[PDB]
Amino acid sequence: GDQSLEESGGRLVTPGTPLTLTCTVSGFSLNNNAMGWFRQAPGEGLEWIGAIYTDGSTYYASWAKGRFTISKTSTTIDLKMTSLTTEDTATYFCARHGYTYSFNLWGPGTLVTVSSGQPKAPSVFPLAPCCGDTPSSTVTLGCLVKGYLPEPVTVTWNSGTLTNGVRTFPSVRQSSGLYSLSSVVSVTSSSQPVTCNVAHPATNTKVDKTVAPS
Amino acid sequence: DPVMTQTPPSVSAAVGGTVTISCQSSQSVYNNDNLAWYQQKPGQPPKRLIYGASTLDSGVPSRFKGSGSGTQFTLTISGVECDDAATYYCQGAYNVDIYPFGGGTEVVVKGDPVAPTVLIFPPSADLVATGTVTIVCVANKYFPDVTVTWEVDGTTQTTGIENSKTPQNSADCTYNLSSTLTLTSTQYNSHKEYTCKVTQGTTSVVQSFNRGDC
């Protein structure tokens, strides 16, 4: 069978700006299943925000009441948020209630970034060993993806056809609020050229960088 | 409004060992057993493991066992494997319309020791031209944890360093690590030797370059 959830709507938002997230459901009826919304702030714990029952009655965490509203159609639930502050920056998840009153199906999440920063595309730079290093049978090459906001970026190699020997590091947020990450790949030194493909959905920007072994 | 408290915050166990996590509820859970456990790995949604305090969800290994009733519950992992490195959460349900989560327990799985391979990447000419240089060091495939130091002309750096460690590998428990040093181009151009030193217990591995060679 094909039961699924998918959240959408996550973006950079300045404090005070309202945002609605949407959770699209497949393979089951909202007339027969309650739904919840949850979040997880970066590096922090999962927390329940609220629920919508089959009759469309809603229930909220103490802190969420009045600021967050849940509604639904035949195939979606939404989360209307107001009075957003930096404390609301998190990954937001929708999940389906089961008759045991725990949550038996989860979407992948959508990222809400509450910030006075501006949507900013990454700058991509090649990572290669120093000129005059003694070469080997293999070489590790990479891309530094820096100065972007919000998360996420996607990084592929050779348009997703090179996956063996790829290491992509978790992003780090600088004190400025911007993110950076690197991705490296180890390839046979005789091998064809490697290109990292960086996409930033928030700015709809794509950068290719063909990394010369140096 | 009921509260779940989970202990311990963190625990380390060797492959094939046993982990035990505890959840206390402030009120009796619904029907004395509406208590669920979830696993979450970085960048992934939570995955429910147990529902109704003791029933394994579909596609959950038999090494996971939930026990307890009323207000006290336990999750035991009998024969921990590298794939079980994750954060675990408990969630109660109640007479009242509240779905609280425990604060989480991080599980670190100790695998076989592996020394890092260390690589250093000097900044690209176009990166130097931005007026801020980022030097990237990687420590690939290692266990247990390393410490990184940066030296510039033999002087230990105390600022401009950012580290990013991957989740534990789900087969062999190993980490990868990126460490970056960030300097102005003026600072970069006024020093010669850049050193990434990666220490694992009593062994250190350096990678160095001379700015003028690259």
């Binding site: 009826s29 309650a34 008759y99 038996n104 199906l105 | 969800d57």
Partner: peptide
């Protein structure tokens, strides 16, 4: 109206 068709 809480719960659902699956555990």
């Amino acid at each position: 109206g809480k719960g659902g068709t699956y555990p």
